[PDB]
Design a protein around this motif. Structure first.
Motif, PDB file in Angstrom:
ATOM      1  N   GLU A   1      -1.510  10.872   0.775  1.00 31.39           N
ATOM      2  CA  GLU A   1       0.178  10.562   0.799  1.00 31.39           C
ATOM      3  C   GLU A   1       0.708  11.418   1.637  1.00 31.39           C
ATOM      4  O   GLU A   1       1.777  11.165   2.526  1.00 31.39           O
TER       5      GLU A   1
ATOM      6  N   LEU B   1      -0.590   7.968   4.727  1.00 30.33           N
ATOM      7  CA  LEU B   1       0.315   6.865   4.042  1.00 30.33           C
ATOM      8  C   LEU B   1       1.488   6.957   5.052  1.00 30.33           C
ATOM      9  O   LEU B   1       1.614   5.907   5.482  1.00 30.33           O
ATOM     10  N   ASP B   2       2.233   7.744   4.981  1.00 32.75           N
ATOM     11  CA  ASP B   2       3.630   7.847   5.785  1.00 32.75           C
ATOM     12  C   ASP B   2       3.364   7.776   7.053  1.00 32.75           C
ATOM     13  O   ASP B   2       4.421   6.853   7.586  1.00 32.75           O
TER      14      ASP B   2
ATOM     15  N   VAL C   1       2.483   3.726   7.937  1.00 29.83           N
ATOM     16  CA  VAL C   1       3.650   3.009   7.876  1.00 29.83           C
ATOM     17  C   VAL C   1       4.564   3.227   8.945  1.00 29.83           C
ATOM     18  O   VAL C   1       5.035   2.273   9.553  1.00 29.83           O
TER      19      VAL C   1
ATOM     20  N   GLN D   1      11.350   0.196   7.474  1.00 23.80           N
ATOM     21  CA  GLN D   1       9.723   0.577   7.752  1.00 23.80           C
ATOM     22  C   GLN D   1       8.698  -0.300   7.109  1.00 23.80           C
ATOM     23  O   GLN D   1       7.774  -0.448   7.382  1.00 23.80           O
ATOM     24  N   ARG D   2       9.144  -0.781   5.535  1.00 23.70           N
ATOM     25  CA  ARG D   2       8.056  -1.444   4.996  1.00 23.70           C
ATOM     26  C   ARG D   2       8.189  -2.976   5.431  1.00 23.70           C
ATOM     27  O   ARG D   2       6.958  -3.633   5.017  1.00 23.70           O
TER      28      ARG D   2
ATOM     29  N   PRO E   1       1.613   2.850  -3.272  1.00 20.94           N
ATOM     30  CA  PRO E   1       1.461   4.123  -3.157  1.00 20.94           C
ATOM     31  C   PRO E   1       2.267   5.014  -1.967  1.00 20.94           C
ATOM     32  O   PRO E   1       2.712   5.976  -2.289  1.00 20.94           O
ATOM     33  N   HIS E   2       2.652   4.374  -1.171  1.00 18.30           N
ATOM     34  CA  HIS E   2       3.583   4.603   0.032  1.00 18.30           C
ATOM     35  C   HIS E   2       5.198   4.747  -0.638  1.00 18.30           C
ATOM     36  O   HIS E   2       5.823   5.981  -0.389  1.00 18.30           O
TER      37      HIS E   2
ATOM     38  N   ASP F   1       4.930   8.021  -2.981  1.00 19.37           N
ATOM     39  CA  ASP F   1       5.012   9.289  -2.131  1.00 19.37           C
ATOM     40  C   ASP F   1       6.538   9.291  -1.680  1.00 19.37           C
ATOM     41  O   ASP F   1       7.176  10.493  -1.659  1.00 19.37           O
TER      42      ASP F   1
END
Ligand SMILES: [Au+]
Ligand SMILES: [Au+]
Ligand SMILES: [Au+]
Ligand SMILES: [Au+]
Ligand SMILES: [Au+]
Ligand SMILES: [Au+]
Ligand SMILES: [Au+]
Ligand SMILES: [Au+]
Ligand SMILES: [Cl-]
Ligand SMILES: [Cl-]
Ligand SMILES: [Cl-]
Ligand SMILES: [Cl-]
Lengths: 173, 173, 173, 173
Positions: free
Chosen positions: B130, B134-135, B138, C71-72, C123-124, C127
């Motif tokens: 995390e 993960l960030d 993305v 972003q997603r 999980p993103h 977070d």
């Protein structure tokens, strides 16, 4: 009524509040326009800030109107903010037209309120608009006109390539 | 086993090592992509660093995974690195798609490992991913999406000219 | 759908948009609260900024949610903003209760969205909320609690004098 | 008449001179108010400067009007200054009401002179008032309103203690 209030018509009080709504609606439109151009499938960073700095400026117009309302002894009444007119904004050109149209509407509301001020003999209100709004709105509409002419001229030749160049070479990021 | 090891499953240990391989393979792909764009007959300096800074970043992901493996009392096992999937990478657009695909694969491996962490009740591992992966993954995939949209839009009009402008005006050198 | 989208549920996409609305509504409530305390017949400068810096922060939460949505590979949909629940906000104490209540509502929406994230195995998203919202909201609610206790303790003795001191000695201007 | 005079009515010339008197009378009232609060048996230093900085500002309004009179080719005529309306000014609250009333009178004289300017088609005079007086007077009356609300709220509880706190915590020294 207020201990300070002087030469402040209920008409103008009410019209100032309507103007706050219009400025907040505009700010919200420019947020929607802003984040549209940040979509991965649109991705024109330059266009995205252009509209996001404009969202800031209209929120500043509404905050300025509210400060004034209080300065005169009026009472801010907030109403619902209707959502922006569109969910997708098209090309940079489609977007920039919509902005002009938006800004012309705000400008006319401003001119409608001067006229009311003159009718009511409210010289502080006239001055207020002249000093903080009328000149800034004329300058902004001109710049949008200028962008429109450049975008039109670019995308007439090659649409997508024209869009890229404009965003790269005119707009900041 | 290790004097320090605590709440560290053999499953996760093994999956961390698989993840190191994937990150090193990715780094190696980005080296191949990098030097491809430095060929005299390709010669897009901007594209070449884009992929070379990415080679550095994935090598940094694998080094970060290895540091952690040791921190938890796991034992790094290295396996062969298969070569990149291609010897020639096509256009900037061909290349940037392959990268997205690469990065989506790394991202899914990351998501597969969170899920394992949750199944194993390994909250340090979840946190680790995390905080560091993960960030960043993305954000990277978004930027690649953004590049893809711009490249597509440019090269639809004039392919080669579109390639030059993108490299000149979006990418750094 | 989007070229970048990965492990991003339509449920969460939709709930993120609902959260943007809630944050914009909150920002609008804090603007109304702000300018109420700038009325000549209320005139507690300190209370006015407290709520105006809070209007800024919630607008920043919504802008952060929108950045993430993009972003997603989600698509921001904006809805109407209903107006604040009240036109007059009473005393500093009345106001500060309403804020707590507002903030508790935002907090619950946040907790509702974590739970959805966990259910969706995103999980993103988890977070994202943990890093930017959960901790800031807990800290804020605490500070409002602290203000509430001080205001209650002051205005129990002498209401108006208590209001003046709190604004003078706790809040900034 | 003057070599420079142009679009400058005898009505406005005369009304400008009346306005100089009003501003000098106000300055003299604020001197009396100022030194009253410096009495050993009143001794509110903060209130004393508040009114003394205001004496300076009104003397500056009259000096500005005189500069303008000369700029337009009018001829300053000075008349007797009647003394302030009171010898003792009561409490801070009594004083601050009297000031509001004073300032509202000056403001109305200003509005009366805009109206005359408009009737005479003297656009330099209108501008002159808009730029240097109208906005400053609105801002000042608001601040006095704000002080009035705070003083009222404090001295309702405990008069003398309320007076001390206001002078200590709102006003400068
Ligand atoms: Au007017
Ligand atoms: Au006007
Ligand atoms: Au976990
Ligand atoms: Au996780
Ligand atoms: Au989660
Ligand atoms: Au969570
Ligand atoms: Au005029
Ligand atoms: Au005027
Ligand atoms: Cl005017
Ligand atoms: Cl977790
Ligand atoms: Cl979590
Ligand atoms: Cl005018």
């Amino acid at each position: 009524s207020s201990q300070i209030r002087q030469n402040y018509s209920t008409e103008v009080e009410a019209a100032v509040n309507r103007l706050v709504n219009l400025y907040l609606r505009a700010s919200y439109t420019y947020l929607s326009l802003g984040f549209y151009f940040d979509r991965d499938d649109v991705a024109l960073e330059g266009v995205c800030h252009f509209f996001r700095e404009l969202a800031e400026e209209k929120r500043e117009g509404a905050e300025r109107l509210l400060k004034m309302q209080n300065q005169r002894g009026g009472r801010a009444l907030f109403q619902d903010l209707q959502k922006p007119s569109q969910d997708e904004w098209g090309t940079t050109l489609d977007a920039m037209k919509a902005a002009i149209v938006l800004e012309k509407s705000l400008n006319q509301a401003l001119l409608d309120l001067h006229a009311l001020g003159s009718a009511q003999a409210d010289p502080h209100l006239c001055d207020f608009l002249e000093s903080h709004f009328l000149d800034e709105e004329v300058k902004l509409i001109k710049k949008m006109g200028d962008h429109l002419t450049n975008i039109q001229r670019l995308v007439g030749s090659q649409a997508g390539l024209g869009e890229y160049l404009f965003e790269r070479l005119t707009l900041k990021h």
